[PDB]
Structure formats: structure tokens, C-alpha cells
Ligand binder design. Sequence first.
Ligand SMILES: CSC[C@H]1O[C@@H](n2ccc3c(N)ncnc32)[C@H](O)[C@@H]1O
Ligand SMILES: CSC[C@H]1O[C@@H](n2ccc3c(N)ncnc32)[C@H](O)[C@@H]1O
Ligand SMILES: CSC[C@H]1O[C@@H](n2ccc3c(N)ncnc32)[C@H](O)[C@@H]1O
Ligand SMILES: [Cl-]
Lengths: 273, 273, 273
Amino acid sequence: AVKIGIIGGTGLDDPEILEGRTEKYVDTPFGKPSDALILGKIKNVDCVLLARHGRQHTIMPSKVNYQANIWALKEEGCTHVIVTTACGSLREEIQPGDIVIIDQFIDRTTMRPQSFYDGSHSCARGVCHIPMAEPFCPKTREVLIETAKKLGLRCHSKGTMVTIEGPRFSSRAESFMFRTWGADVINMTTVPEVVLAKEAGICYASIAMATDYDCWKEHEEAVSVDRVLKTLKENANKAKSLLLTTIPQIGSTEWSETLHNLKNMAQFSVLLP
Amino acid sequence: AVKIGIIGGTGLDDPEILEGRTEKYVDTPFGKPSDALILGKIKNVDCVLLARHGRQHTIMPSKVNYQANIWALKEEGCTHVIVTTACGSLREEIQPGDIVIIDQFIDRTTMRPQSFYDGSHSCARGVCHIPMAEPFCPKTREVLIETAKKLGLRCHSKGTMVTIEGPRFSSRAESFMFRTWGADVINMTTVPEVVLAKEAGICYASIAMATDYDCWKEHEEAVSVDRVLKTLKENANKAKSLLLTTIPQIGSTEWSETLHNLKNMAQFSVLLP
Amino acid sequence: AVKIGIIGGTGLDDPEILEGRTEKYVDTPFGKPSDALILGKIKNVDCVLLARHGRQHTIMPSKVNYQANIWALKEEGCTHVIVTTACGSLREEIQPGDIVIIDQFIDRTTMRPQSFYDGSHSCARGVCHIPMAEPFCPKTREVLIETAKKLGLRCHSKGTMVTIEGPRFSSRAESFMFRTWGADVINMTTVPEVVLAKEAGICYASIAMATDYDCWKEHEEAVSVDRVLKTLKENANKAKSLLLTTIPQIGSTEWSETLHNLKNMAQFSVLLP
Ligand SMILES: CSC[C@H]1O[C@@H](n2ccc3c(N)ncnc32)[C@H](O)[C@@H]1O
Ligand SMILES: CSC[C@H]1O[C@@H](n2ccc3c(N)ncnc32)[C@H](O)[C@@H]1O
Ligand SMILES: CSC[C@H]1O[C@@H](n2ccc3c(N)ncnc32)[C@H](O)[C@@H]1O
Ligand SMILES: [Cl-]
């Protein structure tokens, strides 16, 4: 039995992807999620959709309640979380409209709670030091990659996401610097979403859609909100088709040992008194 | 009609630069500015002076109210902001006493609000993602550079400022590392002052005065407060003369299209519900 | 007259190192220390032991009260602080179980007060900009190094510690990146402990014990809590013997000029109104 949480990003949070939709507002020990949970199905697979920024895109990336979002999806019974994120490209070969099935991150965030085990909640007791060597679910990523190929979509099979605090975009000196560090794409939302999913023992994967080349091409036009939203309007259908085609394959794969190993990794990461 | 905000940094916030001075305490939706606004003139040009650290230098760089400072200058009608900042040199060729007309930054701050659009104020509604490819006003920088030359002052026509959280100085390992990232000078105040100015549609430029070589020369003597203040006492007159000579030239240049483009960039960076 | 504060880290905070032990709970202007102070002696040398994480290891590295810990040790009369810390190795030659007498740090923390001079306490008035070129006491480090040699222990005579916010471990992209920056070992606790010790005019040194290779060897097994605690159980005796043998040598060295110079550096780092 699998149940797929879907966290929709900028321009990529369309509830019409699910059949048999029911709105459910929930609460958590960390406050309210970004919006109502949307319960529904893709073919025979139970899904839960959540708009990262609220359905009106009213919440700034620093202030998104990552804890409540992941807690809510876990509590509703999600075994997997697949998300979409709009991002800047830091590599010539990653063109606007390309999908990147990211496998690493570099944290540049500063103001964000990254753990459920913050001492303030009986629900999560102790100190948790979650391993981050392999932040994204390899098996889910493999299915996404194979499915993107079956769909004929321009897709990158790996990539390192640098997550900045925002809400400002990067300076050119920062953009250049992130490239030297080995970052391939840039956003404001992967961290700590990925970290909290791991603490929850959830199989997490991310569909990153490149929308611009940030500003590391001095000669070329720099990123702006209008440029990002334009690219997403033109390419959103690709992420939608990828999710729609991927999720039924996830539903027919065997997951008990993968989920058992995540559960164990999460459990043994906790130091108790 | 131009009006020039001046934000004076460490050792470089002397109200006697303005003629016809009047003190004005103001409030903002983000709290009180660092000190009273000082209204005055340089030749025929209306100016507003503000001590970044208060006139007694009592406020630590992490706790400076960057939001209130920029909001106050905008509300008083400033079209431009030119600031002074004391900084460490990360490059042999940038000697103590040199001026650097910086054109880029790298953020190393952690605890600082960087946007007016924080959800908590009716004055600034929505989510703002300001572009930072070109953080400093090119036209103002050009006039500063040309004016420094006319004055015979040692001046660098570009430079990348790394802004650290402080209030501690950097370790030697950090100083070395910032050099590899492409930083040329180091301070505790450029970010988020520059970011907020951009959100306000203000033409912002910075006169950085090198006061020391930080600590990347192991063999040489490391930075300290006394070393910084000594260099500033010896060289403050240079920043004063540069401001006094620059501002009248700004006053006689045409600015409507430059200011229109900043206004547009700021306006279109805001996502509304 | 010397008095040695000992801050015990993960797996390395055993009160049985001291003779003639007395528990003393104290308060400070920054709140309660992590646990009771343990007053005692090593040979004729007065010591004060403090468990960084509390004696039950219940406090996460982000939430440790570094200010109260250092203030408490200073107030009890400590001239020196020697600490233990568990860390990941970022260098092939630094093997699990090796000691590293670190001499530099790179800060990657985000949420942490790093100064006593935060404006909120009459006890520490003004703005303090402490120099960090030489964060660790050279004379104490020399004695630690010589003593490790006399004990036949695998020991590294220098090293750069990167301190991450945690409580998560690093991603592989982060681990790789820290190596390119020149970090040799990785933990969650050196900063701001070292910074506050310097502001207090205390001779501070750190015994870092490598417990794992973080995750920069993709082919090899990644760090986890169980792996860390296992290595510490096997090697804790080494840190204990090093402290026991080092402290009496510290007690018979002359320290007045070293301590005078730290006192002066701390005092002159403060800007008053
Ligand atoms: C609405 S544009 C900004 C949003 O899109 C993402 N985004 C897109 C491009 C981009 C970039 N070049 N740098 C940082 N974030 C970016 C961020 O995660 C943020 O929530
Ligand atoms: C009073 S010395 C510290 C002040 O001077 C600036 N400054 C000067 C030199 C320097 C350095 N080497 N590193 C960081 N900040 C520095 C900072 O912005 C801070 O407000
Ligand atoms: C209980 S394992 C985590 C604790 O050990 C330290 N530690 C050990 C190994 C390690 C690593 N590879 N990265 C970061 N911190 C680490 C940290 O300072 C933290 O308090
Ligand atoms: Cl960083």
C-alpha cells in the first residue's frame, strides 16, 4: 500500500491532476500546513496534494511551514512525497524548460527550522541527527528518469540544488560562486523540505524545472519573477504529464524493504536521554 | 528633482558635511531608524544624512534596523542613496586608505530580514523576489569613480564585498576562503542595506574604505578595532571630499529613465494573491 | 594561579576524570548552563567540568547555551578552557580515533548568538568586534600536541574545523564543498564556543576526536549516530588520558603575560558610546 504526497511549487501546483478530489484542512503540532490537503487518485493510486505556497501563492519561501507540511503528509499516511520546484539553471546544458531529477543539495538557507526534534514537542522526543549522504529516494528518481525518457522530455538524471534563503535572487558574484561549489540549479525551497521528509521516513523526490539561467551570464538577460512565471506557463504541462505517468508505476513497484530501511535510518538517528 | 540619502558608516558619518542642517526624528512601519535624519544641502542638492550605527556608534551590525533606515530615506523622498562603509581588504593591491566603488556582494549574514515584504505590514503586500544581478547603481558608481580620479585619490573601479554577520571578525581560514570565492573586501553592513534599497526603487551606491588587510596575511598584523579606527581617522577626509564633490554632479545629471527602470523592476518583482 | 574549565562533548564528558568532585548549579545573565558545574582537581590543579549537552545528552547543538556555558566558567575563575568534540574527518589521513588539535574554524552556523555584547545586558556594554585570526590558544595547543606524542597517540598538530548548524548531517555535495574550502574536520559545536571564550579573555583549546569520514567517500559507508557513538566508546579513553596528563603541565607553566594579552585583546575590542 503506497500513498503519494505531492507538493506543488511555483506555477506547478494544479489540483486538476487528481481525480475524485476532496479538500481536507488539517492541523499539526507545528501549526497549519500551507493550505488544505487535496485527497484524490491518479489511476488506482491514493495521492495527497499540497500547494507549497498556498493555492494563491501568498507565502514567501523563508516563511513556508516545512514542518507542518511534511508532518501533515506523514499523518495522512503518505509513504512517498514527489514535489515540483521552479529553479534557475547554473549550467549551460540545463536549458529553460528542462527537468532535473536532483540528487544532492547545498544549503544556503539561514532562518529555517530543519528538524522535528526541536525539544518543544512530545510528538518528537530527543535529539535527531539525520544522515544526508543520499537525500533523495533513488528508486523514485529512477522511475522519474525512465518516465521522462518514455515521454520524450529533455531531462537531466542528476543535479545539485543550492537552496538560498531569499526572497531576493542571488547576486552575480553569488551565482558565479555557487557554480564553483558544484551547484547545478538554484531555488529557495528544497531545504529543509528534503531534510524533514528524511526524518519522517518518507521516500522523497523532486522534479526541478529550470526557468532561467539565474544571472551568471553577464552578457545575457538576468532572472526576474516575470521571466520565471512565463517559462512555467509554457512548460507546466511537462511536470503534470511526468507526475501522471510516474505515479501509477510507483503504485505497482514493491516498496516494503526501501520503506523499512528509511524507517530504521530515521529511528536510529534519534538520541534519547 | 533628486534627493540624496547619505548613510554614514564607522568613522564616516560626520553631519558637518551638510549645510543648512535640521534634525528630524521619524518612525516607520519597521520601527525607528538608527538615529535622527539630518536634512541639509550640498550646494543646491537636497540631502538626508543618517548615521548607520547611531551618532554615538552604539548599534552592532546584526542589530542595525536596515528596513527602517531605507524606509525612512524613501519616505523623506530620497531618489538616491550613497553610503560609506569601513572594510577589510582581501587583495594586496587594495591598500588601507584606498576607496573601492563596489559592484557586487557575497552574503554571509544569517540573522537579517532582507525584504520589506515579510507578510506583517499592509504597506508592502505580497511576496517580493528582487533581482540582484546588478545590485549597485551603475550611473552613480561611474560619477564616484570619475570624481575620485578628479580628486587624485587611490580608487578601485569595481569590487566584490563579502558581508559577514559579525560582530566577530573572520578567522584566517574564513579570510582565505573568501578570497577563493572571489571576494575583494569584507564588512558587516552592505547586506541587506543594498537589497532593501533595490526593493525601494532607490539608486544605491557604496564608498568602501579599506582599513586593514583582514587576517589572510599570517606573517602580517591582523585586524582589530583600534587598527580600523586609526585608518579611518587618517583617511575620513577622502570620503568626505568624494561625497561633497560627487553629489552636485548627481544633481545636474538626468535621472528620470534610470529611476523609472528601478521603479518598474521593484514593482514587477512583487507577486500578488 | 590557573583554573581549567573542561567542556565535555559527545561521549567525552565523564565526571570521573576529576578527584574531589562537588556539583554546583549556577545561573548567568544569559540563562542556565547546560548542566551543573563539577568542581574538582587533577593532581593539584583546580578544574571545572561542564557537559556541553547536559549529562544525559538531551540538548541539540543549535540550542546549546554557549553564552551561559562560557560565562559560568569565567565567573567560577577559569583561566583556561580545554574541550572535547566528536567530529567527522574530511581528510584521508585523519582516521577515526585520531585526535586533531584544531587551529582554525570555518563558520556554517546560522541561528547562534556569538557575542556577549548583544545590547541586552548591563554586564557587557557596547559593541564588541573580537579578532579571530588566532582562535585557539597556541601555548595550550603545543602542550596538548607534545602530550599526545608522549602518550603514543595518533594526533594531528593542526586542522580546520567547519561547524555546521545541524542537527542534520551534511549532504555529500556539502561534504565535498567543505573539502575544497580547506576544512579538515566537521562538527556542530566549535562555533560559537571558541568565539565567546575569546571575548571572555580565556585561553581556549579543543581536542577533536575523529569518529567517521562524514560522507565524501561515496563508495564507503556514510556517518550515522550509531557509527559516531561506537567510535567514541572505543576511543574515549584517549581523550581522558590526554586531559589527565596535559592539565598538570598547564598548571606548572607560566601564564600571566599570555592571559594579560588575551585580556587586552578582549578589552580593546569593545566600542563604548
Ligand atoms: C516566483 S520566482 C521565485 C520562486 O521560484 C524559485 N526560483 C526560480 C528561479 C530561481 C532562481 N534563479 N534563484 C532562486 N530561486 C528561483 C524559488 O524557489 C522561488 O520560490
Ligand atoms: C569598528 S571595526 C568593525 C566595523 O567595521 C567594518 N569592518 C572594518 C574592517 C572589517 C573586517 N576586516 N571585517 C569585517 N568588517 C570590517 C564592519 O562593517 C563593522 O561595522
Ligand atoms: C551524536 S553524533 C552528532 C554530534 O557529533 C558531532 N559530529 C560527529 C561527527 C560529525 C559529522 N560527520 N558532522 C557533523 N557533526 C558531527 C556533532 O558536533 C554533534 O553534536
Ligand atoms: Cl555559506
